[PDB]
UniProtKB/Swiss-Prot annotation, chains A, D:
Residues 36-69 form a coiled coil. The keyword Coiled coil applies. It comes from Archaeoglobus fulgidus (strain ATCC 49558 / DSM 4304 / JCM 9628 / NBRC 100126 / VC-16). Pfam families: MazG. This is Uncharacterized protein AF_0060. Keywords: Coiled coil. The lineage of its organism: Archaea, Methanobacteriati, Methanobacteriota, Archaeoglobi, Archaeoglobales. The keyword Coiled coil applies.
Length: 84, 88, 88, 84
């Protein structure tokens, strides 16, 4: 795969992860718009800590999911800062 | 009624282009390969991701919000590279 | 280099919103339910799709390119409704 | 499902169908930009004819795929006409 094909595959997975999260009762479908910069930072650090935990437990199956979570929250905070 | 969900792709359409542009800028530099998701080991992709996450944390502590946007692109790319290595 | 693939989502982000807006306009009208993908049979969704495809062909033959855009929204929606019925 | 969730699912499938088509050697990754209105019309009618064939054969498994093809080519022509 070149970058573009990898990125297309990864975006589809990121989106599927977003779907699952927003499907939980009470969850905002637009965290990048609805949350403050501070809350988005806070959330991203939580996700990064979860990724570190998965690495420490050598939980590679869950590692894939945690990489998606981190990528999405990087995107959401980037989005918030890019309007700001 | 507004299709809030389509705002995801409005965001991703921009973010993915910025991630690629960031890959461009660095693919050139010493010790960088055009396909890290394929060329590097899982172990190297990990330590590189952790390095980038450390830089992101450092930007936050310095309150350097300008440079923070770039560090978010780097972390996303390295999540992507390791995800790719792990998924094929 | 340009990320040509992301142009797909730039297009879809607009098109999906227009499809929804078209659903809005017609969900109201007599003999229309808010959830045709759930409320109608496969057979009815089919004949409705075929009806919409016939209207699209009629717009093309009349060279009515303004109204053609609306007929494309209708066909896409009805492909979607039948796909949904078939997929759940 | 409400409209939004259905549409999210359908778009993901439309995109996966697009991926597969563009992966064929020689295929444009941007038919909506690279093709003329006439070629896009021509292509859409071909896809609609294929959908009709699938219905006539009662090939319901292939019917799902043909619905995606038709939706994508409706979108591509709409895109071309919406710039025009
Ligand atoms: Mg997580
Ligand atoms: Mg960095
Ligand atoms: Mg019509
Ligand atoms: Mg076909």
């Amino acid at each position: 795969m070149d970058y573009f094909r990898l990125a297309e595959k990864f975006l589809r997975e990121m989106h599927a992860k977003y779907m699952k999260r927003v499907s939980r009762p009470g969850n905002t479908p637009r965290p990048w718009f609805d949350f403050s910069e501070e809350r988005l930072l806070s959330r991203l650090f939580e996700e990064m800590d979860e990724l570190r935990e998965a690495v420490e437990k050598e939980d590679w199956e869950n590692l894939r999911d945690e990489l998606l979570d981190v990528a999405n929250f990087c995107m959401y905070l980037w989005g918030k800062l890019s309007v700001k």
